[PDB]
């Protein structure tokens, strides 16, 4: 309910994966000489520390070999207000989050503020959770 399984051949630099239980932005992908597993080096979205984790290899059916990692399930919240590096957000069911932080990554705050001031009702934030802690890590505009 918190994670989604992603095939390694669909993982690129910049993707967000769960590494050592933490949501992280991938900054390096390499291959283990001994096992053929892929190794992902990432930056923890919350603490900014580096973490690495290698892929899980499975053989679920004859001649089917799968290598996967976990990615987080992103939630999408409406944006009701913006106040000093945090936002007031609303869930799909109307639950209000008063002080939701916004990651300082790829000018997200500035892009969010421009989109919010053009049309407030169509702006959404994509939100990751880390052990009760929520943060807005990207944005979308609904059509």
Structure tokens at 47: 């603490």
Q: Say how many domains are in the chain.
A: 2
Q: What whole-number distance in Å separates Cα of residue 40 and Cα of residue 48?
A: 15
Neighbouring residues of 45: CB distance < 8 A, sequence distance ≥ 6: 16, 22, 23, 24, 25, 103, 105, 128, 130, 135, 137
Residue finishing a domain among 33, 51, 72:
72
Q: Are residues 90 and 29 in the same domain?
A: no
Give this entry's resolution in angstroms.
1.8
Say whether both 19 and 62 belong to one domain.
Answer: yes
Note whether 64 and 77 are same-domain residues: no
Neighbours of 90 (CB within 10 A): 15
Helix (H, G, I), strand (E, B) or coil at 11: coil
* Paired tokens of 123: 């702006």
Long-range contacts of 99-108 (CB under 8 A, 24+ apart): 100/125, 100/127, 100/134, 100/135, 100/136, 101/134, 101/135, 101/136, 102/135, 102/136, 103/45, 103/135, 103/136, 103/137, 105/25, 105/45, 105/137, 108/136, 108/137, 108/138, 108/139
Q: How far apart are CA 60 and CA 98, in angstroms?
A: 44
What is the C-alpha separation between 78 and 100, in angstroms, rounded?
A: 11
* Of residues 13, 28, 29, 2, the one with CA closest to residue 128: 2
Question: Do 43 and 30 reside in the same domain of the chain?
Answer: yes
**Do residues 86 and 47 share a domain?**
no
Of 72, 87, 102, the residue at which a domain comes to its end is: 72
Last residue of a domain, one of 14, 41, 72: 72
Tokens for 32, please give them.
């283990």
Calculate the alpha carbon distances from 12 to 25, 38, 66, 68 in Å.
10, 12, 17, 13
Residues 6+ apart with CB under 8 A from 76: 92, 124, 125, 126, 127, 140
Q: What is the extent of the structural domain holding 13?
A: 2-72
């Amino acid at each position: 309910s918190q994670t989604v399984t992603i095939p390694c051949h669909h993982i690129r630099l910049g993707d967000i994966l769960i590494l050592q239980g933490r949501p992280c932005q991938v900054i390096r992908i390499s291959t283990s000489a001994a096992t053929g597993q892929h190794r992902y080096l990432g930056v923890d979205l919350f603490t900014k520390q580096l973490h690495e984790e290698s892929s899980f290899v499975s053989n679920p059916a004859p001649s089917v070999v799968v290598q996967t990692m976990l990615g987080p399930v992103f939630k999408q919240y409406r944006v009701l207000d913006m106040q000093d590096g945090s936002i007031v957000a609303m869930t799909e069911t109307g639950d209000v989050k008063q002080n939701l932080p916004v990651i300082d990554q790829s000018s997200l705050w500035n892009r969010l503020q421009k989109a919010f001031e053009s049309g407030r009702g169509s702006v959404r934030v994509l939100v990751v959770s880390d052990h009760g802690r929520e943060m807005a890590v990207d944005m979308k505009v609904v059509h």
